[PDB]
């Protein structure tokens, strides 16, 4: 059910968007641990101090997600 553009909620506790909903940019079909690239509306804390920009996408696994 995980396909590109489907809105999905994160189940990683340590993630910035734990229990938050983001869209799927791409899913990798090769044998990698975290194939689902998920892009979010909000931005992460990542960056240096004083940086106005931050990342808003990450790779996740299948069991780390749920489709809404």
């Amino acid at each position: 059910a995980i396909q590109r553009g489907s809105k999905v909620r994160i189940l990683r506790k340590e993630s910035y968007w734990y229990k938050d909903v983001g869209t799927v940019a791409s899913v990798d079909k090769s044998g990698i641990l975290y194939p689902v690239i998920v892009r979010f509306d909000k931005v992460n804390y990542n960056g240096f101090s004083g940086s106005a920009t931050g990342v808003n996408t990450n790779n996740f696994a299948e069991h780390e997600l749920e489709e809404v």
Partner: protein, 80 residues
């Protein structure tokens, strides 16, 4: 000596190695990533603990993680 531990949520973007100022990190081949590589920290006895590698990591929580431990004359970065 500090402990630089690299976890399996690594995209192989090599930003930690280019951000490292004392050549602690390097890239090894890895079958578990799309980029085909993961970071490793062989000469972690040279780690000062600046966490520039942790700054440059683009994962939601950092795949590379520095644990400040015992302090040596290289961890302090002392010219004297």
């Amino acid at each position: 000596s500090h402990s630089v531990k690299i976890y399996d949520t690594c995209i192989g973007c090599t930003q930690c190695v280019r951000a490292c100022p004392l050549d602690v990190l390097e890239m090894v081949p890895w079958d578990g990533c799309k980029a085909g590589q993961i970071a490793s920290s062989p000469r972690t006895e040279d780690c000062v603990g600046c966490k520039r590698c942790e700054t440059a990591c683009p994962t939601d929580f950092l795949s590379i993680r520095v644990y400040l431990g015992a302090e040596t004359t290289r961890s302090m970065g002392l010219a004297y």
